[PDB]
Design a protein around this ligand. Structure first.
Ligand code: CLA
Ligand code: CLA
Ligand code: CLA
Ligand code: CLA
Ligand code: CLA
Ligand code: CLA
Ligand code: CLA
Ligand SMILES: CCCCCCCCCCCCCCCC(=O)OC[C@H](COP(=O)(O)OC[C@@H](O)CO)OC(=O)CCCCCCCCCCCCCCC
Ligand SMILES: CCCCCCCCCCCCCCCCCC(=O)OC[C@H](COP(=O)(O)O)OC(=O)CCCCCCCCCCCCCCCCC
Ligand SMILES: CC1=C[C@H](O)CC(C)(C)[C@H]1/C=C/C(C)=C/C=C/C(C)=C/C=C/C=C(C)/C=C/C=C(C)/C=C/C1=C(C)C[C@H](O)CC1(C)C
Ligand SMILES: CC1=C(/C=C/C(C)=C/C=C/C(C)=C/C=C/C=C(C)/C=C/C=C(C)/C=C/C2=C(C)CCCC2(C)C)C(C)(C)CCC1
Lengths: 86, 241, 221, 41, 741
């Protein structure tokens, strides 16, 4: 199963939001959006979450971004399977 | 909020993957006291404010300590009969010497060579555990009792100490180890780390038993034979068969 | 103070179950004798239950020993029908009404002692039926009746510590016999044999003859 | 048990227990003496 | 800030001293019952915690422990149902022959000739025929054993003990603080995912490992005694692979996302299983798994102890538009601090849910052999309809209560509540006009049909054979649903329900579900339903909107939510309170639901339920709905007189209890008319004369006998009215549907 096209889709769809989360490209447990939902607020630390990551990428952020990445990758893989591609 | 800076390097000093999993809420009360305190409480279950019932820091610490001791006993009892049957020292077939086939779950396996059936053993075990755990409970509620009432002379060693998790009388600390408080704290940390490893091991043994229908030592041997094929993902097809 | 029913634990009921009554170990978790009048009534009930269960258990044990010895003595759970078959001239309603009436006479004597501790030691009965008191501090009537008729050997007249020791003997043996009769009923229900039969069956075979092997207690093994 | 017995002496508990015992007595009367149309002595 | 568990250690002592003194909870009930009005007010204000304490924390703790007690009562009820299914039921016999054996789970003691109520249901068993559908539910769960029902009854008794212990513990030992109850973000995050989502996932797991193999063997046809027990189906994937071959590969295709290989037991056909007439259990498994995943996704929307998630207050306050001013400003505070507003919202959506349940469960039965038993089907639909209507009326009541008590104008300035309150006259007038228009164009159509039939002019009445009124939108929606598979539902092998169209589903010689055609009579009765619903909405909304104030009475909020009147002045101000609006809306909900269930029973006895004879379908009444349900005389004669012959000729049989209740409920309904039409002063003066008679014989009670208060009289009247009407309909429906079918 390792190295398959669905494996590549899953690792990319789980790893890309994880990278976008740390570098400020994606919403974060410290970086939220306002009322509009497009622009990202500056990093704020009222949650009291700490990490050894220099950019403050918390384990809660890892869990949340990995969860959303798994959801999106599962949707992508199941969509490509049903169309007859993959 | 941003934690408290000076309260964080206490978690960074113990090294490892800690501090990555601690929070500002946890470090409000987790200030280095009690053994095993590595700041890991993301849910805030030991917050002393508004703490009652069993969600209470001393009760939760007591539960952790006796859970980890019971899991150390359970892990050693999981891995001893199978490693003795594999060596052939005991006259038990290694498929029978598996811990969950020892009569704990009769659907999972039965051992009919005990001197009584498991229900009689459970009856006397219920009586004996009722004795032991109820005296333990009343010593927790009153940390000076259980030595004032006669118990065939056994009440002399039931005085305990200030901590319910650490009685350490003439019986509970018969060899008298940890004479000096820092050695006692170090050995307490030893106990809690070994017991939490054993809690993880007991959960793993249960999951492997459901997963592979074989003993944990057999699973370790099969994994060491071919780690690429014999793993969680490689055994994902044949799980209850 | 005294040895409790649950060592340590100082939530023992307020000072109505203090270390004064015989058999007092602070055991009242349901508060069934919290009020003092109910406490005195329940002391009377406990003493009467202990004495009655002691008599009944002694009779059951002796008739079960005689049954295993080959005597023409039925077991306790079937003695009524055996008596009616051996004695067909006795009407069941006759014997039941006679038992009701004779038991009622002495039970109304005891009842009017409960209402008034000093009212039964006069009239037709002599002064020996006045009673000696004991519970709740009174010195008259109650479950403990002195005199030369209910204490004809006089083992609680003289030496008060002897009286206390014998009272503790009586209350402990009475509670033990109440639990013994409960066990007799449960063993008859779960096995269908007598108490001595169960005892010698378990002594002959310690294993495979416990309560889990009768099919009634554990309802599948 | 003074307060518990006072609760048992309260009007709803007493009326429910009283109608229960009266109904049970009448039911067992009809169980042992059924179809009593008249008071035939 | 920071969601966490906060409790108080030992707030209330556990003893019986307040059991001795009734009325302790409220100060107004102190100093003894001087009158019998005290006795009535003691029960009237038992659950009104706002009048007991002013603290929101104590109110919240009381509500939490009352919820635990209610859960214990429900668990006792479930334990009783499972115990009666175990001991006094013919469930095993019914499992062998579900088509012919009538379900029964209650027997009676032969005492006064009442053993005639033990019916000849079948299976060598005598008992009351039940209409609750527990047998179908247990067969769907895959019981097929007496011992398992008893084990479930014991487990439910244990759960009831746990519920009661939890309530005592959370009122007396560890009572949560006010800010614990106000963590609505955490409560929603746990109810969406941990309650509903995890419950759906767990039921999908049970259905996979228990319901599918046992019901598959039952559908293939096997006596339930030799069916393997649920655990050994769950124990190894071998037998499962024999029944569903995708279990040979285990969980490997799940984690590799090759989920299409699970299509043997995770299916999507639609329609009904032809063996049983219920839904496909694999489809139910797929449904429960999908909604469990959806609900667990929904359980991560709100922000708790970590930065991810959105706050409810932030989402509310940002939904403001030009037409509405400040929008949802203040809704978060009046829902996290007022229990009555949450009760109103939850009761409304709960009653709507119950009504939706009734609809979706007649339209397409989810349990095996539920369609063929018309008795349990009609009973379940009618019961859920009545529960939904009651809960909706209670929603109106508690919205009115919130408007009276917990509505503060300071924090509700120019928001949606304020905007609605500032133009209440427009809304109420317009709903009044809609109600009048619907009443005319629904009831007057029936009256015109009556007049033309009675004048000998059948060509002039509104009917399918004369002046047509066809539900073209509804018929086209049925066509869209019927044509959905293979077009707009490519993965569906059949439509959701046979009601849209297609072939007749017949199970055991009886129709499970067949297409329903809509004509003129259906048009008329749907407009009648709309009219009745609109009038009930009008009364409840008028009470809620004018609870605070009015043109006639500007200070109605001072008089409270529940007061009788404000005197005979201003022409007369009788029943001005919002309570009396609930009192009238109760009657109107009764009328609405009664017409709905009458239409349901007649429509499916005339066009759905019936027997098959390999050349057609013989309905129960014979298609008489299409030519008689447009006339009130048709409803009175062909439905209300023709179907009433089963309940009035039921004496001397097992339905004699239904016959007796049919008259007793008439008695109760007409007994209501005493309280509804009369007034307190007459009864007070008559009671004065009776008190004179008692004084003459020294038998005067110290507790002074008073006539029932005006609100007391209205409540007693409406309670008796609804009880009598609903019980009359219940006895009629059950006797008719158990005597013929
Ligand atoms: C970009 C790659 C990709 C591709 C090629 C596909 C392709 C496909 N997806 Mg998919 N999907 C993707 C990404 C992709 N998806 C992602 C990133 C997600 C989020 C994780 C999803 C989540 C998703 C879901 C939830 C579903 C699909 C489904 C489908 C299939 C049918 C779509 C359809 O017509 O729905 C139907 C079109 C409609 C107009 C129906 C909508 C009517 C709704 C029910 C009304 C309800 C109203 C309510 C308030 C909202 C199709 C082969 C469906 C499926 O399961 O396959 C069979 C389906 O249910 N996808
Ligand atoms: C269903 C409603 C409900 C709710 C909302 C609560 C809420 C609460 N309870 Mg409580 N409780 C309940 C029911 C409920 N309880 C019942 C029915 C019982 C009787 C068994 C108890 C007995 C109880 C005790 C003794 C205590 C609480 C306590 C508490 C408080 C902290 C508990 C916590 O979050 O820590 C974490 C909770 C846990 C670690 C328990 C999780 C595991 C348990 C055994 C439940 C597992 C059942 C699970 C859903 C089944 C799934 C299937 C499974 C077999 C695989 C909290 C406010 C504590 C308190 O005093 O307040 C501070 C406390 O000591 N509860
Ligand atoms: C490796 C796990 C481990 C560790 C490091 C500790 C450490 C400690 N325990 Mg603990 N305990 C454990 C497991 C452990 N325990 C288990 C599994 C149980 C359940 C049975 C208990 C139950 C327990 C109780 C009830 C008490 C302690 C106490 C203590 C403290 C007293 C000092 C001491 O004697 O140390 C222990 C030394 C070692 C663990 C190293 C020796 C290891 C050898 C190989 C095992 C010895 C077993 C021996 C062969 C059997 C015969 C013993 C003897 C007659 C020869 C100390 C910090 C007491 C206390 O708190 O004092 C205040 C006390 O009250 N423990
Ligand atoms: C019916 C016999 C009986 C009665 C009337 C009493 C009465 C009394 N006992 Mg006693 N006791 C008994 C039997 C009895 N006991 C037995 C058999 C034992 C040995 C297990 C004991 C051991 C005992 C101890 C150690 C102590 C007492 C004490 C007391 C006193 C205070 C407790 C109280 O007020 O509760 C009132 C009791 C009752 C109202 C009777 C309870 C009956 C319940 C309602 C029925 C359920 C219990 C039953 C076993 C369940 C199975 C029944 C069925 C399913 C088979 C009181 C005067 C305390 C004391 O201070 O001594 C003076 C104390 O220390 N008892
Ligand atoms: C995954 C966590 C979880 C779960 C499963 C539940 C489940 C439930 N909650 Mg709860 N709640 C939770 C978290 C949770 N809650 C949290 C975090 C909070 C704080 C914000 C609350 C605050 C809260 C309030 C204020 C109330 C509830 C209520 C309820 C019950 C809804 C009514 C009903 O009849 O449902 C269906 C019935 C059932 C499903 C029967 C199963 C019951 C078992 C025992 C559920 C066990 C779950 C429990 C949380 C485990 C921990 C307790 C443990 C110590 C035993 C329901 C059982 C209401 C209620 O009825 O009070 C009791 C209510 O008043 N909850
Ligand atoms: C989740 C459901 C729910 C809850 C929690 C509440 C809670 C509350 N309601 Mg409410 N209500 C509800 C649903 C609910 N209601 C529904 C569905 C309706 C429509 C019928 C109403 C209509 C309503 C009104 C009109 C009023 C309340 C009031 C109240 C408050 C005081 C209740 C009280 O103590 O009076 C006493 C409760 C009783 C005396 C219980 C008996 C009620 C009848 C007689 C029982 C019906 C008989 C039953 C079917 C058995 C028949 C068989 C028989 C032959 C034996 C309280 C906070 C009152 C209030 O002032 O609000 C502040 C108020 O007057 N409610
Ligand atoms: C079916 C309808 C109905 C019924 C039964 C009654 C009955 C009664 N009316 Mg009435 N009335 C009605 C309609 C009705 N009315 C209407 C529509 C109006 C116009 C508003 C009036 C106006 C009216 C007036 C002005 C007066 C009466 C009076 C009376 C009482 C006359 C005394 C009597 O005959 O004793 C017969 C008793 C009964 C019929 C009650 C039935 C017996 C019960 C059911 C037995 C209890 C069993 C059980 C415990 C029930 C509770 C169940 C529950 C606990 C679950 C009587 C109770 C007069 C009065 O008060 O008398 C002094 C009075 O002055 N009525
Ligand atoms: C089960 C579902 C989720 C459970 C969540 C709830 C449980 C909470 C437990 C969270 C951790 C607590 C704190 C940990 C903090 C922590 O980790 O402590 C650090 C730990 C040991 O630390 P010590 O206590 O020894 O610290 C002392 C030293 O640091 C002195 O400097 O080192 C490790 O990292 C061991 C773990 C390695 C694990 C190796 C397993 C590799 C398998 C990888 C599997 C994933 C990929 C599979 C692909 C096939
Ligand atoms: C049947 C229950 C009837 C119990 C009799 C009345 C209890 C009175 C009492 O115990 O005193 C209150 C007593 C306080 O003493 P007080 O000064 O008399 O109020 O409360 C207690 O300490 C014990 C309360 C236990 C009540 C048991 C309730 C039923 C438990 C069933 C578990 C399942
Ligand atoms: C920390 C924290 C904090 C935050 O905040 C939150 C959270 C996340 C929640 C957390 C976490 C937690 C956790 C992880 C838990 C887990 C635990 C465990 C696993 C336990 C076990 C535990 C375990 C245990 C005791 C066990 C024990 C065992 C035993 C006895 C055994 C026994 C036996 C043996 C010998 C063998 C034979 O043949 C049989 C038997 C008889 C069977
Ligand atoms: C660069 C760097 C690094 C790296 C790191 C990493 C790479 C990490 C990671 C990690 C990971 C890689 C993670 C993952 C994740 C994910 C998760 C944790 C999730 C989840 C969950 C969920 C939510 C699911 C769901 C579901 C189910 C349940 C089934 C069906 C399907 C679905 C999807 C629905 C280090 C530090 C070494 C060094 C330095 C720097």
């Amino acid at each position: 199963y390792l190295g398959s096209t669905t494996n590549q889709i899953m690792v990319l769809s789980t790893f890309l939001p994880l990278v976008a989360g740390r570098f400020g490209l994606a919403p974060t447990s410290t970086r939220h959006t306002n009322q509009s939902g497009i622009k990202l607020l500056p990093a704020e630390k009222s949650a009291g979450l700490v990490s050894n990551d220099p950019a403050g990428f918390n384990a809660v952020d890892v869990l949340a971004l990995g969860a959303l990445g798994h959801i999106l990758g599962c949707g992508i893989v199941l969509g490509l399977k049903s169309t007859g591609n993959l | 909020e941003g934690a408290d800076l000076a309260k964080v390097e206490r978690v960074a000093k113990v090294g490892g993957l800690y501090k990555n999993f601690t929070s500002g809420q946890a470090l409000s009360y987790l200030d280095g006291t009690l053994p095993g305190d590595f700041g890991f409480d993301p849910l805030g279950l030991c917050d002393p404010e508004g703490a009652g019932g069993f969600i209470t820091p001393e009760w939760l610490s007591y539960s952790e300590v006796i859970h980890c001791r019971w899991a150390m006993l359970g892990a050693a009892g999981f891995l001893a009969p199978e490693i003795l049957a594999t060596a052939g020292l005991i006259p038990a077939t290694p498929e029978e010497a598996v811990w969950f086939r020892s009569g704990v779950i009769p659907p999972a396996g039965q051992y009919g060579k005990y001197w009584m059936d498991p229900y009689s053993l459970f009856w006397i075990e219920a009586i004996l555990m009722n004795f032991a755990e109820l005296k333990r409970w009343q010593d927790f509620k009153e940390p000076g009792s259980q030595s004032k009432q006669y118990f065939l002379g056994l009440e002399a060693v039931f005085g305990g100490s200030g901590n319910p998790a650490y009685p350490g009388g003439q019986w509970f600390n018969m060899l008298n180890l940890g004479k000096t408080p820092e050695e006692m704290k170090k050995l307490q940390t030893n106990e809690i780390r070994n017991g939490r490893l054993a809690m993880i091991a007991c959960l793993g043994c249960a999951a492997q038993g459901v997963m592979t229908q074989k003993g944990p030592f057999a699973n370790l041997l099969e994994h060491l034979a071919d780690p690429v094929s014999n793993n969680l993902l490689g055994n994902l097809a044949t799980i209850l068969k | 103070v005294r040895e409790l029913w649950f060592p340590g634990n100082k939530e023992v009921v307020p000072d109505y179950l203090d270390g004064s009554l015989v058999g007092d170990h602070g055991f009242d978790p349901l508060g069934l004798g919290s009020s003092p009048e109910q406490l005195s009534w329940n002391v009377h009930a406990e003493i009467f239950h202990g004495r009655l269960a002691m008599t009944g258990v002694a009779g059951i044990l002796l008739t079960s020993l005689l049954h295993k010895g080959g005597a023409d003595v039925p077991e306790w759970f079937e003695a009524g029908r055996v008596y009616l078959d051996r004695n067909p001239n006795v009407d069941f309603g006759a014997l039941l009404f006679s038992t009701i009436v004779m038991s009622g006479f002495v039970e109304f004597k005891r009842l009017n002692d409960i209402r008034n501790p000093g009212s039964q030691g006069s009239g037709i009965l002599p002064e020996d039926f006045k009673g000696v008191g004991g519970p709740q501090g009174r010195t008259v009537g109650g479950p403990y009746v002195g005199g030369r008729y209910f204490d004809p050997m006089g083992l609680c007249r003289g030496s008060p510590e002897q009286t206390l020791k014998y009272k503790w003997n009586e209350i402990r043996n009475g509670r033990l016999a109440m639990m013994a009769f409960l066990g007799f009923a449960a063993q008859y229900a779960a096995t269908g044999k007598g108490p001595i039969d169960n005892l010698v069956d378990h002594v002959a075979d310690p294993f495979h003859t416990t309560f889990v092997h009768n099919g009634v207690s554990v309802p599948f093994i | 048990m003074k307060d518990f017995t006072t609760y048992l002496s309260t009007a709803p508990v007493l009326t429910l227990l009283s109608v229960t015992v009266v109904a049970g007595l009448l039911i067992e009367i009809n169980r042992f003496f059924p179809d009593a149309l008249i008071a035939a002595f | 800030k920071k969601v966490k568990i906060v409790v108080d250690r030992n707030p209330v002592a556990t003893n019986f001293e307040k059991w001795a003194k009734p009325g302790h909870f409220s100060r107004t009930l102190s100093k003894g019952p001087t009158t019998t009005t005290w006795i009535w007010n003691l029960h009237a204000d038992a659950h009104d915690f706002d009048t007991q304490t002013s603290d929101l924390e104590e109110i919240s703790r009381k509500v939490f422990s009352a919820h635990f007690g209610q859960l214990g009562i429900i668990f006792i009820w479930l334990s009783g149902m499972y115990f009666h299914g175990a001991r006094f039921s013919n469930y095993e016999a019914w499992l062998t022959d579900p088509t012919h054996i009538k379900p029964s789970a209650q027997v009676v003691w032969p005492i006064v000739g009442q053993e005639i109520l033990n019916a000849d249901v079948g299976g060598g068993f005598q008992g009351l025929q039940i209409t609750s559908g527990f047998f179908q539910l247990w067969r769907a769960a895959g019981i097929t054993s007496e011992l398992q029902l008893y084990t479930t009854a014991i487990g439910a008794l244990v759960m009831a003990a746990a519920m009661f212990f939890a309530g005592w513990f959370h009122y007396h030992k560890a009572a949560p603080k006010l800010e614990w109850f106000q963590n609505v973000e955490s409560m929603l995050n746990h109810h969406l995912g941990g309650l509903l989502g995890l419950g759906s996932l767990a039921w999908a797991g049970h259905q996979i490992h228990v319901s599918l193999p046992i019901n598959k063997l039952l559908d293939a046809g096997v006596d339930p005694k030799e069916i393997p027990l649920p655990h050994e189906f769950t124990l190894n994937p071998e037998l499962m692979a024999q029944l569903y071959p995708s279990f040979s590969k285990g969980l490997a295709p799940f984690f590799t996302l090759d989920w299409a290989q699970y299509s043997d037991f995770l299916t999507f056909q639609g329609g009904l299983n032809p063996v049983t007439g219920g839904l496909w259990l694999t489809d139910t498994v797929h449904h429960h798994l999908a909604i469990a995943v959806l609900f667990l996704i929904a359980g991560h929307q709100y922000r708790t102890n970590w930065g991810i998630g959105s706050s409810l207050k932030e989402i509310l306050e940002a939904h403001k538009g030009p037409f509405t001013g400040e929008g949802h400003k203040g809704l978060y505070e009046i829902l996290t601090t007022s229990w009555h507003a949450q009760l109103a919202i939850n009761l409304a959506l709960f009653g709507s849910l119950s009504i939706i349940v009734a609809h979706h469960m007649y339209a397409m039965p989810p349990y095996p052999y539920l369609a063929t038993d018309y008795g349990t089907q009609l009973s379940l639909f009618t019961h859920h309809m009545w529960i939904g209507g009651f809960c909706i009326v209670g929603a109106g009541a508690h919205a009115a209560i919130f408007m009276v008590r917990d509505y503060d104008p300071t924090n509700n300035y120019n928001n949606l509540l304020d905007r609605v309150l500032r133009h209440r006259d427009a809304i109420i007038s317009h709903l009044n006009w809609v109600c009048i228009f619907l009443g005319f164009h629904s009831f007057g159509l029936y009256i015109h049909n009556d007049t033309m039939s009675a004048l000998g002019r059948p060509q002039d009445m509104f009917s399918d054979t004369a002046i047509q009124l066809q539900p073209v939108f509804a018929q086209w929606v049925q066509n869209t649903h019927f044509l959905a598979p293979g077009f707009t539902a490519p993965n569906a092998l059949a439509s959701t329900s046979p009601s849209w169209g297609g072939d007749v589903v017949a199970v055991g010689g009886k129709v499970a579900m067949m297409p329903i055609s809509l004509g003129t009579a259906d048009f008329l009765v749907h407009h009648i339903h709309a009219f009745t619903i609109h009038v009930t909405v009008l009364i409840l909304l008028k009470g809620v909107l004018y609870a605070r104030s009015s043109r006639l009475i500007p200070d109605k909020a001072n008089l409270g939510f529940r007061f009788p009147c404000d005197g005979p002045g201003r022409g007369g101000t009788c029943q001005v309170s919002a309570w009396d609006h609930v009192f009238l809306g109760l009657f109107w909900m009764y009328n609405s639901i009664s017409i709905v269930i009458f239409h349901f029973s007649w429509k499916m006895q005339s066009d759905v339920w019936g027997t098959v004879s390999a050349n057609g379908v013989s309905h129960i009444t014979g298609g008489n709905f299409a030519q008689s349900a447009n006339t009130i005389n048709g409803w009175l004669r062909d439905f209300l007189w023709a179907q009433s012959s089963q309940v009035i000729q039921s004496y001397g049989s097992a339905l004699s209890a239904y016959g007796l209740i049919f008259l007793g409920a008439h008695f109760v309904w007409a007994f209501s008319l005493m309280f509804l039409f009369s007034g307190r002063g007459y009864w007070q003066e008559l009671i004065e004369s009776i008190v004179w008679a008692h004084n003459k014989l020294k038998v005067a009670p110290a507790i002074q006998p008073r006539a029932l208060s005006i609100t007391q009289g209205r409540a007693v009247g409406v309670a008796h009215y609804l009880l009598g009407g609903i019980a009359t309909t219940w006895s009629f429906f059950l006797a008719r549907i158990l005597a013929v079918g």
